[PDB]
Amino acid sequence: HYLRILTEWEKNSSPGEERGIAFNRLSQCFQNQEAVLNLSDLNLTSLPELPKHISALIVENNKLTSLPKLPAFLKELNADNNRLSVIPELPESLTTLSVRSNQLENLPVLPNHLTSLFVENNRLYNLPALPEKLKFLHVYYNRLTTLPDLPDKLEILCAQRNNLVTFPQFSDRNNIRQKEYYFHFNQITTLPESFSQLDSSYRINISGNPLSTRVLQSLQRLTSSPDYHGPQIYFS
Amino acid sequence: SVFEEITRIVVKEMDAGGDMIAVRSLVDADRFRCFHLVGEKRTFFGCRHYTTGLTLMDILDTDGDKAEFQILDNVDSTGELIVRLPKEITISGFHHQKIKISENRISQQYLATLENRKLKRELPFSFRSINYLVTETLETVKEETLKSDRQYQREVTIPPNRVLSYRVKQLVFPRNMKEKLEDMESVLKDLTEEKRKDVLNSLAKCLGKEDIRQDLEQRVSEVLISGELHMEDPDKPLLSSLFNAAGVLVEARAKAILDFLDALLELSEEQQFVAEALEKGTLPLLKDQVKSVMEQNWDELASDPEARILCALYVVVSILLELA
Could A207 and B84 be called an inter-chain contact, meaning their C-beta atoms sit closer than 8 Å? Predict the structure, then answer.
């Protein structure tokens, strides 16, 4: 019976907090056993206990700094445009985790059934073990220098505007489907030969990075050969 | 032009030096949305893209027209993205400033089935005389009012769901200025004084007349296709200068003359300057000022929109002065 607590939370709406609207929204979901909880755009500075039945919480565009425990059956979490300093435990049920536009410097352990991870515009310094189920990863606008080894089924990887200095190790063509990886504006000087073994399914943008003249010549010679059907590559 | 600034920023942060292309005018944005058609123009500075007002729906066999909407079922949203605006950009009405965008892509499976598909038996005259398709679109998720204090305060209100960047794929059915101008100048030096005069007499007609410019561009290209001097042509001496003494068309001459024309496209207001100069023989002076500004505000520019504009004036003035 935290419904009274829900009311209390409302009574504690600091000037600007639209806690009442959320109170109604939360009550409705609880009474109707709803499955979608979105308290975004409510100027919330805190969040009351969440119903364990919900599997999708949308709380973006708010002034949150920490999040209550997440239902063990959650599958999608949207906390963008928040000042979150840390994210609570991730349920193995979670498949989508977007907390961009935050101040996260480290990330909790990632379930192995997660397919979407958006953690851009953060102060992340190191990323946790990446689950293979993840097909999309956005880690841009962060201060990362060492990307963890990429999973096998990684389709999109936007890892630009970071402090990366060394190119990452791939799955060695464990995936034969189209793949777009972005590594531009990162401080990389040299690259691995493993790249020479990747198919044209790979699309890589390394433009802006401080690559060495040697690699430039090499890669320029590679991109000027008809026999070369290697990965679509971009550089500058 | 500020719209272009934001669009270019989006492209740089998302895919710098990549298939991504930027929307140059906010009015023609909705026409660059996915499944739309975009055509290419001849511009030496680089391939330019213009809207068509047509969509793959208008050319494909709709299987009846009773339900053309099912195609959109092939449209996928990779999700949303964030672009950190620079310092000169301010979201009027937050020390770190960023904008939120949405990515829409056409399913690869529909891209595969595209080639193995039938067009409508009846097609628009535009498509009938058509002889690419937008594949990805990054659009605004909400209204964004931005302002810039950059110089070479402007304000732009981008309505929501407005395409900012776009990637296109070919539609199929069942380079350094210094080098360029050098090459062109060389091609022209291998020409008689009389012939060069003829070319000049024409290119001077092209000054200040987009009508004459398009006409002479079309005609140079036409006699480059046919390769035969027409019996009579209103600009016959130009195309005559295109052919050598043996009459064998030196394709370099035409390509370059077209290139000069392509550049002249980039100079709308400045054109008067060049014309007055050619009318007074001050061209040499103008060439120098262009060179000074280029060298002064740019280190090894021949290694800003103005930069491209300047390179054009150099090319145009250089060629003209070389003909005279």
Answer: no
